[PDB]
C-alpha cells in the first residue's frame, strides 16, 4: 500500500469485467406505463379505534369548556336527553365471537352507570367481560426444558399479512372527512399580543385558517382521537388492574355560538400492565350509530352490532322514527399508538403550511397579501376530486380540509404499508413530474420500483385507497397529455 502507484488499474479491470454489468437508461414516458395492481381477497374492514362517519351523538347544551366537568357526569347528562331505549337484540353477529357476551357487556355497563356513585366507574370482572377484554389469554410462561417435548409447540405465526380488496367505504369515509360542519371542534389557546405588522398579517390569515380547520369534519376526528388516547393512556398507567369505563366525549361550540357536550358511546379499558411500547391494552368500544350494518356487512367484520333503541328524529318536513344501533367490538392499542393519537393536532400544521405556502407563493408574484382574495373570491381553484362529469376543482378552503383529512387519515390508519407505499410511490410521482417539466427522465429498473410500491399494498383500507388515488391521478395525467411528440404538458 505504501509503495503502490496507479497504472491504469481501474481501466484494466473495467476492460476485463462483463458488459452484462451496466446501468441501461430506459426512457420514461407516463403514457406508456401501467396502473398499479391492487390485490384480491375478502374486502378490507374498518380498523379505526372509533366510528368516523357512522358515529352518532347524544348531546346537551352546556357552557362547560373543552375539558371541564367530570366525564361520567357529562356522560349521564347526555344519556338523560334520550328516551326510547329497548331490550337489546343482536342485529349483526361478530362471526368469530361469543355474541351473548357483547349483549351482556352492554347490559352490565348500562346498569353499572345507573348504580355509580362517584367520579370514576370500575366494572366487576364478570365472565362475559373477562372474555371481551382478553383475561388470561396469554399462554403461561415456562422454561423450555419443562415444555421441550410438546408436539404442537411451534414458533409464533410469523407470516406476511393476509391480502384484502379495496372496499368502497374508505373513499366514502374520506369524502365526509373533507366536509364542513356546523360546529367549531377545536379551541385554540391564547397568543401574546400582535405588535409586529407581520404578526397582525399572520393573525388575519390565521382567522381564515382557524374557522376552516376547526369546522372541518376531520377536526372532530382529531378531538375524538386526542380524548380517547389521552383517557386510555392516563387510565392505563394509574388503574392497571381495574376495568375502568371511559365515556367517549367531545365538546364543541356551534356557529350559532352555544357550547355543547357530545356523547358518542363508551370504552371499557381492559388490564393494562404495559411494559414495552408495543404492549397491548385490550378494550371494548360500545358506540352509538344510525347506520344499518347489513347494507355493508363486510365493513364490520370485527363488530357485533346490537339494536338498543328507537329515536324520533326531527326534520324540516316531519318527524321520522329510526332504529338506534350500538356498534360493539373488542379492540386494542399500545403506548406508542396512544402517544401519537394524543398528538393528532399536528395534522392541522401539515395541511395549513401547504395551504399557506400556496398562498404565499402567489403573494410573492402579485407582491401583495393574497390571503383575502383566496378565501373570499373563487378564481384560484385546484383539482381535488373526480365525479362522473369529470375532474372537479375546489377553493383554497376545500384544499385545506382535503389535505387536513389526508393527514388525519394517515394518523388514524398508520401502518408500515403506508410508510413503504408513500416512500416508493414518491419516486414514481417525481418521475412523472420530471417528464412533465420536459426534463427527459430515465429509469434503470422500472419493474423493480413498481414491485417495491406494490409489495406494500397488502390489506390496509387507507393504503389501498391511496394506491387507487395514484391510478386515478395517472389516468388524469394521461388524458390531459394524450398522443403526440409535442403534447399538452399544461393541465387546464
Amino acid at each position: 500500500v505504501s509503495s503502490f502507484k496507479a497504472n491504469g488499474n481501474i481501466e484494466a479491470k473495467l476492460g476485463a469485467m462483463s458488459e452484462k454489468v451496466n446501468a441501461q437508461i430506459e426512457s420514461f414516458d407516463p403514457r406508456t406505463i401501467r396502473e398499479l395492481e391492487l390485490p384480491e381477497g375478502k374486502f378490507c374492514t374498518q380498523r379505526s379505534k372509533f366510528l368516523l362517519m357512522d358515529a352518532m351523538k347524544l348531546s346537551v347544551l352546556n357552557p362547560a369548556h373543552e375539558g371541564e366537568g367530570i366525564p361520567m357526569k357529562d356522560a349521564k347528562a347526555c344519556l338523560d336527553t334520550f328516551w326510547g331505549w329497548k331490550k337489546a337484540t343482536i342485529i349483526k353477529k361478530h362471526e368469530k365471537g361469543v355474541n351473548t357476551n357483547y349483549l351482556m357487556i352492554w347490559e352490565q355497563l348500562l346498569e353499572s352507570i345507573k348504580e355509580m356513585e362517584g367520579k370514576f366507574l370500575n366494572l366487576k370482572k364478570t365472565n362475559h367481560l373477562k372474555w371481551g377484554l382478553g383475561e388470561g389469554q396469554a399462554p403461561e410462561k415456562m422454561d423450555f426444558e419443562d415444555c421441550k417435548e410438546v408436539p404442537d409447540l411451534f414458533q409464533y405465526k410469523s407470516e406476511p399479512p393476509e391480502k384484502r380488496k379495496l372496499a368502497s367505504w374508505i373513499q366514502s369515509e374520506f369524502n365526509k372527512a373533507s366536509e364542513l360542519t356546523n360546529s367549531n371542534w377545536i379551541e385554540f389557546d391564547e397568543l401574546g399580543n400582535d405588535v409586529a405588522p407581520i404578526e397582525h398579517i399572520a393573525s388575519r390569515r390565521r382567522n381564515f385558517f382557524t374557522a376552516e380547520v376547526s369546522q372541518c369534519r376531520a377536526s372532530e376526528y382529531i378531538m375524538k382521537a386526542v380524548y380517547i388516547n389521552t383517557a386510555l393512556l392516563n387510565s392505563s398507567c394509574t388503574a392497571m388492574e381495574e376495568y375502568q369505563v371511559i365515556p367517549i366525549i367531545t365538546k364543541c361550540r356551534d356557529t350559532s355560538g352555544q357550547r355543547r357536550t357530545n356523547l358518542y358511546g363508551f370504552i371499557i379499558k381492559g388490564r393494562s400492565h404495559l411494559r414495552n411500547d408495543t404492549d397491548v391494552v385490550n378494550f371494548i368500544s360500545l358506540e352509538f350509530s344510525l347506520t344499518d350494518p347489513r347494507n355493508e356487512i363486510h365493513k364490520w367484520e370485527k363488530y357485533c352490532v346490537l339494536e338498543i333503541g328507537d329515536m324520533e328524529i326531527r326534520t324540516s318536513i316531519s318527524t321520522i322514527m329510526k332504529p338506534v344501533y350500538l356498534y360493539v367490538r373488542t379492540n386494542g392499542t399500545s403506548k406508542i399508538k396512544m402517544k401519537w393519537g394524543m398528538e393528532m393536532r399536528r395534522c392541522l400544521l401539515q395541511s395549513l403550511q401547504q395551504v399557506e405556502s400556496m398562498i404565499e407563493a402567489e403573494s410573492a408574484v402579485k407582491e401583495k397579501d393574497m390571503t383575502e382574495p383566496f378565501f373570499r373570491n373563487r378564481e384560484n381553484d385546484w383539482p381535488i376530486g373526480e365525479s362522473p362529469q369529470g375532474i372537479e376543482k375546489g377553493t383554497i378552503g376545500k384544499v385545506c380540509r382535503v389535505l387536513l383529512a389526508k393527514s388525519v387519515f394517515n394518523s388514524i390508519y398508520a401502518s408500515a404499508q403506508l410508510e413503504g407505499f408513500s416512500a416508493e410511490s414518491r419516486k414514481l410521482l417525481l418521475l412523472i413530474q420530471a417528464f412533465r417539466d420536459n426534463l427527459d427522465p430515465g429509469t434503470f429498473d422500472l419493474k423493480g420500483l413498481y414491485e417495491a410500491i406494490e409489495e406494500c399494498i397488502i390489506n390496509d383500507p387507507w393504503v389501498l385507497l391511496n394506491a387507487s388515488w395514484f391510478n386515478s391521478f395517472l389516468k388524469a395525467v394521461q388524458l390531459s397529455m394524450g398522443s403526440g411528440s409535442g403534447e399538452n404538458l399544461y393541465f387546464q
Partner: peptide, 19 residues
C-alpha cells in the same frame, strides 16, 4: 369569516340527529 361549501344534506344529520 364563515367558511362554506357547495353541498347539502336536505333531511337530517345521522351524526347529529335532531331529537
Amino acid at each position: 369569516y364563515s367558511p362554506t361549501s357547495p353541498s347539502y344534506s336536505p333531511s337530517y344529520s345521522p351524526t347529529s340527529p335532531s331529537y
